[PDB]
Design a protein around this nucleic acid. Structure first.
Ligand SMILES: [Mg+2]
Ligand SMILES: [Mg+2]
Ligand SMILES: [Mg+2]
Ligand SMILES: [Mg+2]
Ligand SMILES: [Mg+2]
Ligand SMILES: [Mg+2]
Ligand SMILES: [Mg+2]
Ligand SMILES: [Mg+2]
Ligand SMILES: [Mg+2]
Ligand SMILES: [Mg+2]
Ligand SMILES: [Mg+2]
Ligand SMILES: [Mg+2]
Ligand SMILES: [Mg+2]
Ligand SMILES: [Mg+2]
Ligand SMILES: [Mg+2]
Ligand SMILES: [Mg+2]
Ligand SMILES: [Mg+2]
Ligand SMILES: [Mg+2]
Ligand SMILES: [Mg+2]
Ligand SMILES: [Mg+2]
Ligand SMILES: [Mg+2]
Ligand SMILES: [Mg+2]
Ligand SMILES: [Mg+2]
Ligand SMILES: [Mg+2]
Ligand SMILES: [Mg+2]
Ligand SMILES: [Mg+2]
Ligand SMILES: [Mg+2]
Ligand SMILES: [Mg+2]
Ligand SMILES: [Mg+2]
Ligand SMILES: [Mg+2]
Ligand SMILES: [Mg+2]
Ligand SMILES: [Mg+2]
Ligand SMILES: [Mg+2]
Ligand SMILES: [Mg+2]
Ligand SMILES: [Mg+2]
Ligand SMILES: [Mg+2]
Ligand SMILES: [Mg+2]
Ligand SMILES: [Mg+2]
Ligand SMILES: [Mg+2]
Ligand SMILES: [Mg+2]
Ligand SMILES: [Mg+2]
Ligand SMILES: [Mg+2]
Ligand SMILES: [Mg+2]
Ligand SMILES: [Mg+2]
Ligand SMILES: [Mg+2]
Ligand SMILES: [Mg+2]
Ligand SMILES: [Mg+2]
Ligand SMILES: [Mg+2]
Ligand SMILES: [Mg+2]
Ligand SMILES: [Mg+2]
Ligand SMILES: [Mg+2]
Ligand SMILES: [Mg+2]
Ligand SMILES: [Mg+2]
Ligand SMILES: [Mg+2]
Ligand SMILES: [Mg+2]
Ligand SMILES: [Mg+2]
Ligand SMILES: [Mg+2]
Ligand SMILES: [Mg+2]
Ligand SMILES: [Mg+2]
Ligand SMILES: [Mg+2]
Ligand SMILES: [Mg+2]
Ligand SMILES: [Mg+2]
Ligand SMILES: [Mg+2]
Ligand SMILES: [Mg+2]
Ligand SMILES: [Mg+2]
Ligand SMILES: [Mg+2]
Ligand SMILES: [Mg+2]
Ligand SMILES: [Mg+2]
Ligand SMILES: [Mg+2]
Ligand SMILES: [Mg+2]
Ligand SMILES: [Mg+2]
Ligand SMILES: [Mg+2]
Ligand SMILES: [Mg+2]
Ligand SMILES: [Mg+2]
Ligand SMILES: [Mg+2]
Ligand SMILES: [Mg+2]
Ligand SMILES: [Mg+2]
Ligand SMILES: [Mg+2]
Ligand SMILES: [Mg+2]
Ligand SMILES: [Mg+2]
Ligand SMILES: [Mg+2]
Ligand SMILES: [Mg+2]
Ligand SMILES: [Mg+2]
Lengths: 210, 147
RNA sequence: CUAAUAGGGAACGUGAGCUGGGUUUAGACCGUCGUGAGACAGGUUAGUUUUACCCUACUGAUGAUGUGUUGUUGCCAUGGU
RNA sequence: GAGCAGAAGGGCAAAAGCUCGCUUGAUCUUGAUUUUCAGUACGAAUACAGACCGUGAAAGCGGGGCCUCACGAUCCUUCU
RNA sequence: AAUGCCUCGUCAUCUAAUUAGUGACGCGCAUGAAGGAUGAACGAGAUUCCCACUGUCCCUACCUACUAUCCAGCGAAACCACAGCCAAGGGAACGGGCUUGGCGGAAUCAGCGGGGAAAGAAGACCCUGUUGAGCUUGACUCUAGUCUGGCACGGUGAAG
RNA sequence: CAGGGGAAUCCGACUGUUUAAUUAAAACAAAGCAUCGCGAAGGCCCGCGGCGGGUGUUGACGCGAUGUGAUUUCUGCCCA
RNA sequence: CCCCGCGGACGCUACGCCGCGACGAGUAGGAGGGCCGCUGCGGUGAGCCUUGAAGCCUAGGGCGCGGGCCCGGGUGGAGCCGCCGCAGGUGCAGAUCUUGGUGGUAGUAGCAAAUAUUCAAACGAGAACUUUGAAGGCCGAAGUGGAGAAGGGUUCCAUGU
RNA sequence: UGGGCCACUUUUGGUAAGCAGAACUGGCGCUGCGGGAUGAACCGAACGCCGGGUUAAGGCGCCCGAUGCCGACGCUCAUCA
RNA sequence: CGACCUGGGUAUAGGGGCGAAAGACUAAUCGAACCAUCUAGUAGCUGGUUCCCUCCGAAGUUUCCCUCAGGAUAGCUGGC
RNA sequence: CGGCGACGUCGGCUACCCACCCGACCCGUCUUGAAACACGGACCAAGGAGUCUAACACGUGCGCGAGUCGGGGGCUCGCACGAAAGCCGCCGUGGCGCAAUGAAGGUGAAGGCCGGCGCGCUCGCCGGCCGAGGUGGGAUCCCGAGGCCUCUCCAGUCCGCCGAGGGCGCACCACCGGCCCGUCUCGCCCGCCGCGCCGGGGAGGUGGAGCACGAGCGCACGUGUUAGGACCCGAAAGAUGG
RNA sequence: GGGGACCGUCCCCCGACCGGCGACCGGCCGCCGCCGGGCGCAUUUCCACCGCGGCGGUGCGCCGCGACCGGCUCCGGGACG
RNA sequence: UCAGUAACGGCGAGUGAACAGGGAAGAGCCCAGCGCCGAAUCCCCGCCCCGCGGCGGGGCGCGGGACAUGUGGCGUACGGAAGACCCGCUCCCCGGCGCCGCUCGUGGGGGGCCCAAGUCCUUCUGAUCGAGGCCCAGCCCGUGGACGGUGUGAGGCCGGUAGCGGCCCCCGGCGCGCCGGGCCCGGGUCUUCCCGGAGUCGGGUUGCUUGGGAAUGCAGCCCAAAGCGGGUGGUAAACUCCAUCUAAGGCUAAAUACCGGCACGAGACCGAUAGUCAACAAGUACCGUAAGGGAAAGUUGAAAAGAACUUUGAAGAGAGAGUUCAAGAGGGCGUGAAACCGUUAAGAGGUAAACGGGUGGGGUCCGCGCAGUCCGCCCGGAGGAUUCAACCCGGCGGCGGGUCCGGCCGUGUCGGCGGCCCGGCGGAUCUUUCCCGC
């Protein structure tokens, strides 16, 4: 029964919840287990980067996050094509590739091919047979400079262009931001009905002259 | 700590604080929000007006990201940039005004609560309010729009 | 018939006192009522009546306190009548 | 001592009754208040304010019936 | 009348006396025809009377067997706030306790059925519960099965 | 060892059966009477399901469903 | 300008100490305090203890309004407590409460369905009851007789206790 | 907590009721204590543990504290006071 | 001497069976067996509800409710 | 000031038994009312009932504070304790708060004083300032005439206390204005790479869980309500499978 | 993208002046106190005992008595207006 | 996390996701079809060799069969194929021979055996592991002071514990030279070609289901496709543009779950009516025809040293004796409460007991009770002894000192001599007008 002022509460405990309760007493054990597995995997892929393949630069989808950039699933086929890496060879040198991602603009495409080129310059390719190097790399640099990179490969950072203070021009001072927004909203709202009324006026004009 | 509770003090008192006449029974009055229109009507009308009935249009598949638009007021506008920016702008001999991009700081709309200091400033935002734009222009600033 | 066949109370005295004819379970019949299941301070028939060895009360039966022990013969307070 | 639709009570005389004439204030609106009351709702009612009107020479009076009763949430439907 | 309220109907008969019985009457509260009315035989069925018989009774007595009783051995249970003499008072309006009075003498045995509103069972009567269940029905809402139409399996020829 | 008898009234015809553990009855059954359905691609019924199954190794003098309750005697009127 | 005396009680865990005035009923219920009590953990007591822990008993000595506590004596034989915090499966007279034990009843009800026993002897610590003998009875062949089915499962048979 | 009940007075129904229902204040419930022999409510008075004093209501033959006053004035005889 | 009594073997299983019908019988259980589980079913109803002291201290009334043995609400209470 | 004091006496109101006077009905419980002829209770021992989770609300304590919070993940020989603790900061994603209002499209919280201009037309283009208005209360604080002093007076040296009045006014309260969103009524203007069935503005009422120089966030504790077996024990029943 | 410049905080120093030596410490002085060792060996100092010694505090092992003072209270005499 | 939200709901009670974002993990692919390639393909049976450790490789068969009603190679929506032209030779996966780095947080795993230091002195006790001590800065070891056993309570008595400690045996995947076999061309440009899953989608209706609301998903029945087509685009429909994917075939590790099992470790849990029903010959005894129901029940002592022997009795049972520290531990034996019972002792008793208040009597104990306290100063008497004060030396403290001298501390204060090479970290502050990508 309600008692004086309060909040109308709707607890979701009508459904035998006590049989399905997930305790978390194995959480520290799970953290230990995952950490040990990570260490073992890093040991297994001895000079290769621990975190894994290099991921592309990707812009977050919706209107809430599209000002932000994160790591994607893999480099697109167009990116690999214009960077000059075979799509079946990239996955062996540690480049992730997403065959289902397209590129809608050229700026993201160019940023990701610059990323691929920089990674390709940073790569140290060991020869397949250590005694005989065919086209991999120089032993002088691969003997010393080869170490296991920790963390993501070239981690994706959000870059902000610095805006230097400038003198405000009279055009900027005369621009009406609120009126521009209101008129833009009205124009987008009434674009279709205006076109229909213009078509009907064309029909009226021809029937009046005829 | 169970040693700090009324149950420790209620040992020896037969009814445990629930009365001898009305007792402590299972569910007198119903379970949950039972009878909110019948025998708890006074409570519901008194403390939760508007509880019963429908109002407005329903909208399936609401995506809150579409309507995401955080706002910042003009009185907090100058806190989005460093102290050095404002000080240098104040002591600048030229007409160079700093740019505050509120989208970079994480806001889309600039609202016009509060007053601004008397310094020209270029504000970049997705949306403006009429009074925010008026107050920005009154200090000699400008409002530019971004998408 | 008799002198007279007065009226009453005691958990409408009295069921571990009895009896069980009546009412008041379950079976059944009739009449009335109800569409029906069923109902009827309507009629009719058949239908398990358990325990006292405790306390008291009462009835009888031993005894007990006191006169040193014990016995015989007695008195009558009280109660009944 | 009649009448005012009705129960009763109150009220009422160049009235509030009777007969005429013109009408649609029985309309469109926002709030406040009273009554029951928890000072919640409904119903009913009072005083205003803004429109548009009626009547009267006008002052005014009128947003139903002289006053006290004559009535109805959520959800759904229907109309404007 | 196993069916009649009024009703112990009225008349006759049975008895000293009959709310009983039988016969009869019948505007029959509310008899009655697949059930009405009869009719032998039958019945651990209900009822009335007569003969005979008797302890059913007047009106109780005596006898027998087994108990009870006493003893040796053996040995429970129910029940139990504390307990256990009354009268009146007042009191949850019927006290073992309280008040006022009557009074009160160890430990016991055989009986007894007045009390302990004795024991047995969380009253089955009665009411309440937004507690049921068995059953019924044009209660509300359904449902198996059935009747019917349509589509499919589903084809070949003719006439109308 | 081994029937008391007689005159009647009510009910059920009889014999039979019945509520193991309160009712042995007038209750149920019964033969008799009457009605109803059905000719098998059927009647009545079972089955979650199969052209499954019982009556049925049956066929109207038979199955199935009802009422009343031997014999005798009657069984009236009403289809709103 | 203290000085023949060189001196002068206690106090003030300030969450402490002191003073003054008024007041004190209480079911249901609320609150505070608990140096009341139980069990376990972190600290601490250079804690206690086989020269005797816990527990239990006690006409022993006391303290507190009380919840309770301390100490003596006995028994016991291996562990236990104080303080500061922490944490509860933390306090019982009741629930026709649960389990266990024990009373009165009470040496009581009772060991009363189917006729019935008696004498002598033996064995034996011991005989109403066992065994033998004698007598008197019963079942009375639809048996208290002789054999089976089902069911039981070694009860069958000796010897011993 | 949302069963109330009682008393003075007012008061409705009822023949009345230790009945049913209202108003006002107090009380009992929740409350012990002195008195009414006894008693939820009446009268006095409300309560921490004590000593002294004094009262209330009520009493002062004996139970049983206190008239064991040379108390005052009358009335009254009851074979149900 | 019969619709007779009876052994064993078989068949029918729970909203089912079987019933010469009593709601009878269906393993001392029948107006719906027994066993386990859902299940610690729900209960406005009955019973119980465990240490001490100190301080404060009620209500049986209003309004609404398929409300009348219950709630919400206001009142009365305590604490801060 | 007196008496008495070791094998007999002295003190010990507690504690054991007994006696007497007064008082005293059996507890629990429901109840207007229990000693009840109302129910449970023969006795003793041990067990035995408001708990935990989640969610709210308010109060209190702590830290930080327009912010706050790592709780999920990751890094530190992987591990007696340690499943702890520590750290991350381009792990703060995110939550809650910092903005409301409307069904929605959407919109979205600064005014006051002093001047010259239109007509200072109930007012539009500016300037200068200040930076959330005012009224009545308002703890505290500030000023303060006049007094309170010594062995005494004519005359100033430095401050202490009382002080009528006066001032600035915290929080909070009442009231009046103002602003934001919705919605009515009235009305005249302005804007333009879209001259529009376009966009903006004003005044006066009114609806809002609003603004008007933030108070929140996290943690702990208490209380209350609620969903859960839900303080403990208790149905008649219903369902599934045997 | 680097590398610079600037700004803001910092970390050490070179230094002059300012408040103080502080609850951050040493050295010197001055005063004071204590301890150890000398000297001081007696009208000083200290130790233990005795007196039924005096003055102070607490208090008598037990049982008791008295006195005056003060607080409260109940009474009784005497006298004045 | 979104989110108790959008939504569903007698819009009542109640129910209720997803996307984006941050993380754990991360991995991709294969057919059918269309095509080309003399079926290139596969299974089985024989015989020979290498082998065995799960039965494979190689070779032969005028040896069978499967299969054109389609096996294999290329190839699969990310396009693919074939021809040209150009460029790049770049190097695959199996099973062993000997040996490493000895595999890995310092053995990879399994198993076996081992590795420090008091039983020192004196004592307590029934026994001790107790108590005191152990000169050299302290008994000895300690990378070991976890735990358990042992007659007590033990780092050093024993097992163990610590250790990138030791020894032995066995097992498994990691590189090199070789061995035996397979092992066959990749990319870029152009040209010419080739491109897809049907009683399926979709529609109607019915029933269930979902937050899915003019129908989210699933299924039944009926209708039943297309190929610039089809599906989706959270309000039914028509037109139109756009976006996005490519259904009706298939495989796939990791992160995730785990009240059964095998083997471990731990705990602010329970401590024999508790904790599992079960600490024990427990799913046992027992109950029911069956399904099923289902207990109670731990403890002598350090060691059995478990009472020899005598004596009464027929024996149970006793009295002596004996063991033990203890039988006042005697085989359901640690301790041994209460209720209840027996006996002994004291007291009492006709108003059932019991209780509150107040006394009294008796009794049991307590009081080191029994000539009753101490101690400060002073007076007197009788005695001792260093030494009392004051001075000298030394040490140590307290206080004060213009800082007398330092060392300083807070606060300013200039040159920054001093820090982006000769000090750091930040900044939403400006730049090559020296330097690495248009
Ligand atoms: Mg990862
Ligand atoms: Mg209380
Ligand atoms: Mg009530
Ligand atoms: Mg008489
Ligand atoms: Mg009677
Ligand atoms: Mg009787
Ligand atoms: Mg009887
Ligand atoms: Mg009878
Ligand atoms: Mg009957
Ligand atoms: Mg009979
Ligand atoms: Mg006499
Ligand atoms: Mg008007
Ligand atoms: Mg009759
Ligand atoms: Mg007769
Ligand atoms: Mg007759
Ligand atoms: Mg007929
Ligand atoms: Mg009496
Ligand atoms: Mg009852
Ligand atoms: Mg009952
Ligand atoms: Mg009700
Ligand atoms: Mg029902
Ligand atoms: Mg119907
Ligand atoms: Mg018959
Ligand atoms: Mg007949
Ligand atoms: Mg029979
Ligand atoms: Mg019977
Ligand atoms: Mg019978
Ligand atoms: Mg016939
Ligand atoms: Mg027939
Ligand atoms: Mg006819
Ligand atoms: Mg008082
Ligand atoms: Mg009190
Ligand atoms: Mg408990
Ligand atoms: Mg108990
Ligand atoms: Mg109790
Ligand atoms: Mg006997
Ligand atoms: Mg007998
Ligand atoms: Mg014979
Ligand atoms: Mg035989
Ligand atoms: Mg009354
Ligand atoms: Mg009450
Ligand atoms: Mg009161
Ligand atoms: Mg009172
Ligand atoms: Mg009294
Ligand atoms: Mg009286
Ligand atoms: Mg007094
Ligand atoms: Mg008297
Ligand atoms: Mg007297
Ligand atoms: Mg009289
Ligand atoms: Mg019946
Ligand atoms: Mg239950
Ligand atoms: Mg209603
Ligand atoms: Mg009740
Ligand atoms: Mg009760
Ligand atoms: Mg009553
Ligand atoms: Mg009582
Ligand atoms: Mg009574
Ligand atoms: Mg009774
Ligand atoms: Mg009761
Ligand atoms: Mg009991
Ligand atoms: Mg009882
Ligand atoms: Mg207990
Ligand atoms: Mg951590
Ligand atoms: Mg964010
Ligand atoms: Mg003000
Ligand atoms: Mg205002
Ligand atoms: Mg609340
Ligand atoms: Mg429960
Ligand atoms: Mg149901
Ligand atoms: Mg939220
Ligand atoms: Mg659901
Ligand atoms: Mg092929
Ligand atoms: Mg060793
Ligand atoms: Mg040990
Ligand atoms: Mg050890
Ligand atoms: Mg080791
Ligand atoms: Mg749409
Ligand atoms: Mg157990
Ligand atoms: Mg035990
Ligand atoms: Mg024996
Ligand atoms: Mg011993
Ligand atoms: Mg023992
Ligand atoms: Mg004794």
């Amino acid at each position: 029964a309600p008692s004086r002022n309060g909040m109308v509460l709707k607890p979701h405990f009508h459904k035998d919840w006590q049989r399905r309760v997930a305790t978390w007493f194995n959480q520290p054990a799970r953290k230990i287990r995952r950490r040990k597995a990570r260490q073992a995997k890093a040991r297994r892929i001895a000079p290769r980067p621990a975190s894994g393949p290099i991921r592309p630069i990707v812009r977050c989808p919706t209107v809430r996050y599209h000002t932000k950039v994160r790591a994607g699933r893999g480099f697109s086929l167009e990116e690999l094509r214009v960077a000059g890496i075979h799509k079946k060879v990239a996955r062996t040198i540690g480049i992730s590739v997403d065959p289902r991602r397209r590129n809608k603009s050229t700026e993201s495409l160019q940023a990701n091919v610059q990323r691929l080129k920089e990674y390709r310059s940073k790569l140290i390719l060991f020869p397949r047979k250590p005694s005989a190097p065919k086209k991999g790399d120089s032993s002088a640099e691969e003997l010393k400079l080869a170490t296991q990179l920790t963390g993501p490969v070239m981690p994706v950072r959000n870059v902000y262009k610095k805006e230097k203070a400038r003198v405000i021009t009279e055009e900027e001072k005369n621009f009406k931001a609120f009126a521009s927004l209101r008129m833009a909203r009205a124009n987008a709202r009434l674009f279709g009905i205006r076109a229909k009324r213009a078509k009907e006026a064309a029909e009226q004009d021809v029937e009046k002259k005829k | 700590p169970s040693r700090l509770r009324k149950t420790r003090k209620l040992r020896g008192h037969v009814s445990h604080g629930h009365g001898r006449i009305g007792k402590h029974r299972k569910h007198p009055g119903g379970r949950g929000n039972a009878g909110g229109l019948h025998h708890h009507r006074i409570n519901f009308d008194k403390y939760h007006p508007g509880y019963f009935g429908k109002v407005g249009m329903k909208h399936y598949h609401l995506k809150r990201n579409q309507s995401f638009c955080p706002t910042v007021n003009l009185d907090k506008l100058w806190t989005l940039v460093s102290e050095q920016t404002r000080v240098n702008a104040a002591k600048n001999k030229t007409g160079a005004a700093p740019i505050i991009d509120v989208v970079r700081s994480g806001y889309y709309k600039v609202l016009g609560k509060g007053k601004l200091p008397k310094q020209p400033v270029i504000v970049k935002a997705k949306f403006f309010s009429r009074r925010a734009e008026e107050k920005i222009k009154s200090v000699g600033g400008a409002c530019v729009l971004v998408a």
